[PDB]
Design a protein around this ligand. Structure first.
Ligand SMILES: Nc1nc2c(ncn2[C@@H]2O[C@H](COP(=O)(O)OP(=O)(O)OP(=O)(O)O)[C@@H](O)[C@H]2O)c(=O)[nH]1
Ligand SMILES: Nc1nc2c(ncn2[C@@H]2O[C@H](COP(=O)(O)OP(=O)(O)OP(=O)(O)O)[C@@H](O)[C@H]2O)c(=O)[nH]1
Ligand SMILES: Nc1ncnc2c1ncn2[C@@H]1O[C@H](COP(=O)(O)CP(=O)(O)OP(=O)(O)O)[C@@H](O)[C@H]1O
Ligand SMILES: [Mg+2]
Length: 271
C-alpha cells in the first residue's frame, strides 16, 4: 500500500537532540536539578532521543537523574529522592511540573519540549545470560513497582546492530513506530499493545542477514515475517541489552502481543 520512497520517509528521525527546543529543555532542566543536587547526580538521556528513534514532531525527552553519590562520589530512600526532585523542578518551572507514576513531567512551551525527568539509583543485578553482574538503574513507581533498566547496554547494542545492518535496524524500528501510532489513531490496536522498547527488542532479534541494503520494502517484509513466525514458534528473544530475556516472567508483555501487532502491521501495509 506504500511505496519504497514512503517507507524511506517514515524511516527518518523526526525529533533529535540537535533540535533547539530539545537543547533548551535539557539546559533548563539540568540547571534546576544541579541547583539542588550538585554533583551528587549523573544526568543523561534515555529513550527515543538517546537511541535516535523519534518519529513524532516535538516529542518528549526522557532525562534520567541518577542519584549516585555512593557509587560515583565527589573526587535516603526513593520517596524522598522523587519528592526532592519534584521540588527542585517546581521551584523553577512552577505550574508546568506534574508528578507522574514513573517520573516528574516538566511540560514544555513555545521554546522547549516537554521532558520526563526520571530520578533513580544505581542498580546492580546478575545476568545469567552473560554470567556477569550488570549495572543499570532502578526506580520505583507510585504504584509500588520496582522499575529496572539498562539504558547504556540498550544504547550500545542497538547502535552496533544498526551499524552492521546498513543502518536499517533503527530505520525499521522507526517505520514500525509510525505504523504503531497510525494503528492507535485508527483505533485498530490499544495504545499499550506494544511500546517503543518492545518494538526495538523485537526487531533487534531479527538476524542481520535479513536487512537488505537499499531495499526498504523487502527488508520490512523480512522483519515482519521473521518476528511473526518466531512468535508462533515460541522464540527466546533477548532484550537489546543482551543481559535478560524479552519474554521473562518479570514482563507482562507476551509473544501473543507481538504476533498480533505483526499481523496488524502486515495487514495495514498491504503485503
Ligand atoms: N527494560 C525496559 N526499559 C524500558 C521499558 N520502557 C521504557 N524503557 C526505557 O526507557 C526509555 C524511554 O522510554 P519510552 O519513552 O517509553 O521509549 P522511547 O524510546 O523514548 O520511545 P517514545 O515512545 O517515542 O518516547 C527506553 O529507551 C528504555 O530504555 C521497559 O518496559 N523495559
Ligand atoms: N562521531 C561521529 N559522528 C558522525 C559520523 N558520521 C556521521 N556522524 C554524525 O552523527 C550524527 C548521527 O548521525 P546518524 O547516526 O547517521 O543518525 P541519522 O542520520 O539521523 O539517522 P540514521 O542514519 O537513519 O540512523 C549526525 O549528526 C551525523 O552527522 C562519524 O563517523 N563519527
Ligand atoms: N522500564 C522503564 N525503564 C526506564 N524508564 C522507564 C521505564 N518505563 C517508563 N519509563 C520512563 O518514565 C517515563 C514515564 O513512563 P510512562 O510510560 O509515560 C508511565 P507514567 O506516565 O509515569 O504513568 P501515568 O501517566 O499514569 O502517570 C517514560 O517516559 C520513560 O522515560
Ligand atoms: Mg520517550
Amino acid at each position: 500500500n506504500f511505496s519504497e520512497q514512503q517507507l524511506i520517509n517514515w524511516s527518518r528521525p523526526v525529533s533529535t537532540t540537535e533540535d533547539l527546543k530539545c537543547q533548551n529543555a535539557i539546559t533548563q532542566i539540568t540547571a534546576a536539578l544541579r541547583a539542588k543536587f550538585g554533583n551528587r547526580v549523573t544526568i543523561f538521556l534515555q529513550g527515543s532521543y538517546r537511541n535516535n528513534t523519534n518519529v513524532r514532531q516535538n516529542s518528549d525527552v526522557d532525562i534520567v537523574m541518577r542519584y549516585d553519590d555512593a557509587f560515583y562520589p565527589d573526587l535516603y530512600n526513593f520517596d524522598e529522592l522523587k519528592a526532592d526532585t519534584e521540588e527542585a523542578l517546581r521551584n523553577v518551572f512552577t505550574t508546568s511540573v506534574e508528578r507522574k507514576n514513573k517520573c516528574i513531567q516538566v511540560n514544555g512551551n513555545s521554546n522547549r519540549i516537554t521532558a520526563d525527568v526520571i530520578p533513580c539509583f544505581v542498580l546492580k543485578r546478575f545476568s545469567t545470560l552473560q554470567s556477569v553482574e550488570a549495572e543499570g538503574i532502578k526506580f520505583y513507581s507510585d504504584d509500588n513497582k520496582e522499575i529496572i533498566s539498562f539504558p547504556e547496554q540498550h544504547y550500545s547494542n542497538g547502535t552496533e546492530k544498526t551499524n552492521q545492518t546498513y543502518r536499517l535496524y533503527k530505520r525499521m524500528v522507526r517505520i514500525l513506530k509510525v505504523v504503531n501510532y497510525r494503528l492507535i489513531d485508527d483505533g485498530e490496536i490499544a495504545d499499550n499493545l506494544v511500546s517503543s522498547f518492545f518494538i526495538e527488542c523485537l526487531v533487534y532479534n531479527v538476524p542481520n542477514n535479513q536487512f537488505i541494503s537499499g531495499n526498504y520494502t523487502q527488508t520490512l517484509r523480512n522483519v515482519i515475517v521473521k518476528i511473526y513466525e518466531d512468535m508462533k514458534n515460541n522464540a527466546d528473544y533477548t532484550e537489546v541489552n543482551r543481559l535478560f530475556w524479552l519474554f521473562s516472567n518479570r514482563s507482562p508483555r507476551t509473544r501473543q502481543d507481538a504476533l498480533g501487532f505483526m499481523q496488524k502491521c502486515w495487514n495495514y501495509l498491504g503485503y
